[PDB]
Design a protein around this ligand. Sequence first.
Ligand code: HEM
Ligand code: HEM
Lengths: 145, 145
Amino acid sequence: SVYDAAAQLTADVKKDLRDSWKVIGSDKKGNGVALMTTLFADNQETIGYFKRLGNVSQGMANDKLRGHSITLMYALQNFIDQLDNPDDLVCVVEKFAVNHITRKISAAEFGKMNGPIKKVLASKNFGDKYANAWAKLVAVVQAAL
Amino acid sequence: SVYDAAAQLTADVKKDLRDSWKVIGSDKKGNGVALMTTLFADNQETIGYFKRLGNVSQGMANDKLRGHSITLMYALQNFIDQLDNPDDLVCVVEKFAVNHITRKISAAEFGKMNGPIKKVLASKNFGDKYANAWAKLVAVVQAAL
Ligand code: HEM
Ligand code: HEM
């Protein structure tokens, strides 16, 4: 199942993922926080899953939110680093899904991250072509939920 | 406290952490699995916390163990990257501790990783000086458990 989704990661898709990550991943704190705050802005209901982070309206200044945001970026770093070996990509994605499954986060709920990603890519001038590539990566994770 | 522990990361300790990580972090899959297998070999009592992984003796062939081992290395990568900013290191460490606290992993339990780290370091020609630097980093996490 996850393997089949991974099959959509064509040579061109992996190339766009790597090229865009080279920029996005260069500022994990800044972009990580941008993703989370955008998610909360566009889909307020997702805040229900982050009660532990406290006052998320504080953004970057909120230590717990900042800690979560930076950490989230290292999961993507992990995924990006395993793109050339489907076997490693798959085992890393299934390992990542475990805690999210426990939190009862469905594939549909997880898919809400596509908008924030598209918006962050755009802020760095990466168009639809790149947003589509990332949608495919998110789809691999969705296959594991 | 975690804030006092973070202050123990002096200039040379940070430098030795970076220099050794440059090598160790080069092969996350290889060294990550070596780290876990050494832990299970030297402290069989810890295997109980990893029931979900299945037959841990299979090493690299165990997909779940490989997935976990690779992922563990990105938490260390995270810590190393935050060495420049104590405030970020602390929020990233507390974030990391949440799940380990939920699993009831105590500071004493966590410290058992010092043995495996020292051995992997040694296998790459990094002696006591480096093992001690890493123990200082591990102590920051212990302070948060
Ligand atoms: C590209 C998307 C995402 C990435 C890379 C990501 C990454 C992570 C990582 C690495 C962690 C820490 C390890 C763990 O506990 O699992 C985590 C925690 C968490 N994630 Fe995800 N996640 C993503 C999307 C989501 C979404 C869409 C939701 C909810 C709507 C979600 C909810 C959670 C929650 C509630 C936590 C715990 C937060 C805390 O209390 O510190 N994640 N995620
Ligand atoms: C260098 C030290 C260590 C690092 C960097 C580390 C890293 C991680 C990471 C990144 C995860 C995934 C996120 C999460 O679920 O929290 C994790 C999971 C876990 N860790 Fe730690 N950990 C370390 C030591 C330990 C020790 C010493 C124990 C137990 C004695 C432990 C027990 C666990 C368990 C049971 C899981 C879940 C495994 C699974 O079911 O997939 N960790 N750890």
